[PDB]
């Protein structure tokens with residue numbers, strides 16, 4: 001859908017990407033066994049959910065290496081409508097993963113820059129994400145700044 | 155809940171009092187009643203794919219029964235991911251207790267209720283971002299440090 005430098009392109013995730021997306025996401029978190037039919041239903045949900053305003057709530061993107069037609073990186077930006085900032089739109093970048101054979105050559109930065117473009121084009125006033133301390137420097141190279149602390153419960 | 159308070163989902167008539175409550179957190183600005191009614195309709199209809207009826211947005215208010223005044227508000231947004239076997243992640247957002255009602259246990263009660271809503275829906279974790287000043291409050295609510303929040307502004 002959109003070409004990137006050095007033989008890559010970016011496009012929305014599709015139903016046929018399950019295996020390649022699973023392989024890429026391993027570097028982040030365990031995906032586990034997912035049935036093709038369930039994934040098809042997830043993609044349908046991600047391709048229909050819209051934000052009250054067309055704004056897609058979910059924007060699951062894959063960067064594909066043209067040399068082998070393999071998914072090299074994936075990331076998502078989710079759009080949230082809030083009450084604050086006069087019903088503002090806030091973007092949330094999530095599930096960033098560069099396939100282990102494709103790290104250290106600029107793809108992470110290219111992916112984040114693309115997600116940021118998507119969010120600001122929908123009208124988000126800010127885009128946020130959470131990362132471990134060891135990744136802060138990567139996000140600073142992408143134009144982000146420290147905004148707070150991520151807390152969790154399980 | 156303690157004597158004299160109750161919790162319920164936010165409603166269209168809550169605009170004026172929710173605007174006042176959220177000012178302790180950030181700038182709300184002016185919102186028209188027509189637009190707020192449309193936002194509450196969006197929040198009362200948007201469901202997450204999974205029957206299990208999962209609302210994407212779960213805006214709650216704690217109300218002082220003496221005068222039916224909103225004393226606190228918070229929301230938990232439910233996200234469907236691919237990782238963790240098409241897992242659900244809860245995102246707590248926009249937590250605010252009016253100044254006059256702070257330090258009486260209402261913030262912890264609100265968080266506890268949002269956490270219950272998220273785990274009852276099947277979330278594998280619930281996360282939130284906060285400024286350093288709020289960390290000890292969230293630790294008293296059972297949360298632990300998970301990472302760093304980063305942001306980029308338009």
Ligand SMILES: CC(=O)SCCNC(=O)CCNC(=O)[C@H](O)C(C)(C)COP(=O)(O)OP(=O)(O)OC[C@H]1O[C@@H](n2cnc3c(N)ncnc32)[C@H](O)[C@@H]1OP(=O)(O)O
Nearest residue numbers: 095096097098103104105106107108109129131134137138
């Ligand atoms: C919102 C989240 O989802 S956070 C979770 C992110 N994901 C993960 O940690 C999974 C495992 N790691 C990865 O998938 C990748 O290595 C990523 C996403 C962290 C980074 O992507 P990469 O493609 O490897 O990095 P990329 O080559 O674009 O790096 C761009 C710049 O950041 C730097 N950089 C990359 N990672 C780091 C790091 N951890 N610490 C410091 N600097 C870094 C690079 O040196 C480069 O600097 P330069 O421009 O001066 O040469």
Ligand SMILES: CC(=O)SCCNC(=O)CCNC(=O)[C@H](O)C(C)(C)COP(=O)(O)OP(=O)(O)OC[C@H]1O[C@@H](n2cnc3c(N)ncnc32)[C@H](O)[C@@H]1OP(=O)(O)O
Nearest residue numbers: 248249250251256257258259260261262282284290291294
């Ligand atoms: C995801 C987010 O939206 S983060 C934004 C959070 N909101 C804001 O910062 C706006 C301004 N502040 C507020 O709205 C409120 O003061 C809140 C939400 C931070 C806290 O709510 P409150 O009702 O004041 O706190 P509550 O009385 O429930 O306190 C619960 C526990 O935490 C403790 N606590 C509260 N604030 C603090 C603090 N600043 N430092 C240390 N401990 C604290 C209390 O003493 C209490 O302890 P206990 O359970 O041992 O008795």
